Design a protein around this ligand. Sequence first.
Ligand code: POV
Ligand code: POV
Ligand code: POV
Ligand code: POV
Ligand code: POV
Ligand code: POV
Ligand code: DU0
Ligand code: DU0
Ligand code: CA
Lengths: 92, 92
Amino acid sequence: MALVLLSFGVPRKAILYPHEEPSWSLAKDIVFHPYWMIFGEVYAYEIDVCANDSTLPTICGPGTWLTPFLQAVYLFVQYIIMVNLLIAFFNQ
Amino acid sequence: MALVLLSFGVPRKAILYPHEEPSWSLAKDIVFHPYWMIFGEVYAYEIDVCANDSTLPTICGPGTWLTPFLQAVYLFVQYIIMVNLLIAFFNQ
Ligand SMILES: CCCCCCCC/C=C/CCCCCCCC(=O)O[C@@H](COC(=O)CCCCCCCCCCCCCCC)COP(=O)([O-])OCC[N+](C)(C)C
Ligand SMILES: CCCCCCCC/C=C/CCCCCCCC(=O)O[C@@H](COC(=O)CCCCCCCCCCCCCCC)COP(=O)([O-])OCC[N+](C)(C)C
Ligand SMILES: CCCCCCCC/C=C/CCCCCCCC(=O)O[C@@H](COC(=O)CCCCCCCCCCCCCCC)COP(=O)([O-])OCC[N+](C)(C)C
Ligand SMILES: CCCCCCCC/C=C/CCCCCCCC(=O)O[C@@H](COC(=O)CCCCCCCCCCCCCCC)COP(=O)([O-])OCC[N+](C)(C)C
Ligand SMILES: CCCCCCCC/C=C\CCCCCCCC(=O)O[C@@H](COC(=O)CCCCCCCCCCCCCCC)COP(=O)([O-])OCC[N+](C)(C)C
Ligand SMILES: CCCCCCCC/C=C\CCCCCCCC(=O)O[C@@H](COC(=O)CCCCCCCCCCCCCCC)COP(=O)([O-])OCC[N+](C)(C)C
Ligand SMILES: C[C@@H]1CC[C@@]2(OC1)O[C@H]1C[C@H]3[C@@H]4CC=C5C[C@@H](OCCC(CO)CO)CC[C@]5(C)[C@H]4CC[C@]3(C)[C@H]1[C@@H]2C
Ligand SMILES: C[C@@H]1CC[C@@]2(OC1)O[C@H]1C[C@H]3[C@@H]4CC=C5C[C@@H](OCCC(CO)CO)CC[C@]5(C)[C@H]4CC[C@]3(C)[C@H]1[C@@H]2C
Ligand SMILES: [Ca+2]
């Protein structure tokens, strides 16, 4: 469940913030939001940052149409496959 | 789980945005929010768009009182029937 988190957090922080000098924030923001997604916080007004309902209208740029797909793939793994593999673990 | 998504996404985008010329946005918005609902994002201030607490006070029009019902029916299927059919699948 932590590979999948960084499988998703590294492409997204790369696709959305493509001017980042080296920083320690690149160690939180590849791990931060993808962890709070496991608990149902979808950051729905930060998907599709080019949309009109966005809290992030400044992050709109080339390639930022890819993150809705990556996240679709992400939660299907982190909320349906894997977090319900735990449930089946404990129950058995 | 993808019929139910479009069983719901097509009536809602038809009932709420009834002036839409042909567009590629009609291929996202019939699939977008009904997918993030499966993960607990209810878009609670976008149900009942005619209400006073709405983020969508401009979408108020004829027929838009139907979407709270469709969505009630939707999540009962996509969060109680079907997403707990997975759980029972994996556990067994
Ligand atoms: C043994 C079992 C292992 C356990 C797990 C591994 C250990 C956990 C590892 C975590 C990675 C390390 C994170 C800290 C990195 C330094 C951050 C920093 O310096 O600045 C940050 C500040 O913000 C913070 O310091 C907040 C604390 C970090 C968030 C922790 C997330 C935990 C949830 C996820 C955990 C799941 C991990 C999933 C696996 C990958 C950001 O930079 P800044 O610019 O200073 O901030 C902006 C400030 N400003 C606006 C005023 C300008
Ligand atoms: C399923 C039933 C539902 C309907 C289906 C219908 C299918 C028909 C689909 C048709 C897609 C092609 C038409 C869109 C292109 C028009 C141009 C455009 O808007 O470009 C946008 C890019 O947006 C994209 O490129 C959109 C994503 C394209 C791929 C679609 C998924 C592949 C099919 C599924 C397979 C997936 C694999 C699954 C893996 C498991 C750019 O515009 P913007 O976003 O505003 O950003 C630019 C902003 N800026 C200029 C300031 C920087
Ligand atoms: C093998 C397994 C199959 C997997 C599933 C099938 C594949 C997935 C199918 C996907 C349908 C195709 C979607 C893209 C269509 C083109 C969008 C476009 O061009 O414009 C859109 C841009 O926004 C985007 O491009 C965002 C990318 C799509 C979001 C996908 C959501 C995933 C969740 C659902 C996944 C579950 C699917 C459930 C089944 C139905 C919007 O229009 P615009 O005007 O260009 O943008 C506004 C910008 N402006 C405000 C600045 C003006
Ligand atoms: C359950 C226990 C709780 C209580 C029960 C009590 C029951 C009593 C029921 C009473 C219903 C009638 C009262 C309202 C009619 C007055 C007109 C009105 O307000 O219209 C509004 C529409 O809103 C409606 O039409 C409301 C929904 C009507 C159907 C009721 C549900 C069916 C019963 C249940 C079975 C379901 C089947 C289940 C399937 C599985 C219009 O006003 P607006 O919304 O502002 O939109 C207009 C905006 N505009 C003017 C700008 C365009
Ligand atoms: C049956 C299933 C079929 C679906 C399969 C996928 C088929 C579709 C594949 C690819 C779709 C590519 C076209 C969509 C983007 C168009 C808009 C655009 O360029 O937006 C932005 C940049 O966008 C880029 O720079 C994207 C560059 C090409 C794709 C990058 C790699 C992703 C694909 C890797 C492969 C993934 C394969 C995944 C396989 C699972 C900005 O817009 P612009 O236009 O650049 O400039 C401004 C606007 N203007 C110039 C108009 C004024
Ligand atoms: C025991 C079970 C009982 C329940 C069963 C259902 C029974 C109840 C059935 C139907 C309720 C219809 C009345 C409610 C709407 C009134 C308000 C209204 O018109 O709002 C808006 C438009 O609304 C429309 O234009 C709706 C037109 C009629 C219904 C459309 C088909 C939906 C029902 C299909 C069948 C579904 C069957 C489902 C069965 C599972 C706007 O208001 P207006 O007034 O038009 O204009 C403005 C306001 N003014 C003029 C006042 C200034
Ligand atoms: C198997 C896993 C693959 C992924 C991964 O774990 C192992 O690989 C690790 C490598 C790490 C980076 C290494 C070095 C630096 C340089 C530093 O520079 C401070 C400069 C300045 C600040 O202002 C000083 O003043 C910033 C942090 C950064 C980029 C690391 C980020 C986290 C990364 C990407 C880790 C990531 C989680
Ligand atoms: C079994 C399932 C039943 C439902 C469904 O899947 C199969 O049936 C599909 C038919 C699709 C539409 C067909 C043609 C177009 C025309 C295009 O026109 C671009 C015009 C302009 C843009 O500005 C060019 O410049 C816009 C998209 C649209 C309306 C499709 C949307 C998605 C739809 C509704 C699909 C939907 C998910
Ligand atoms: Ca939740």
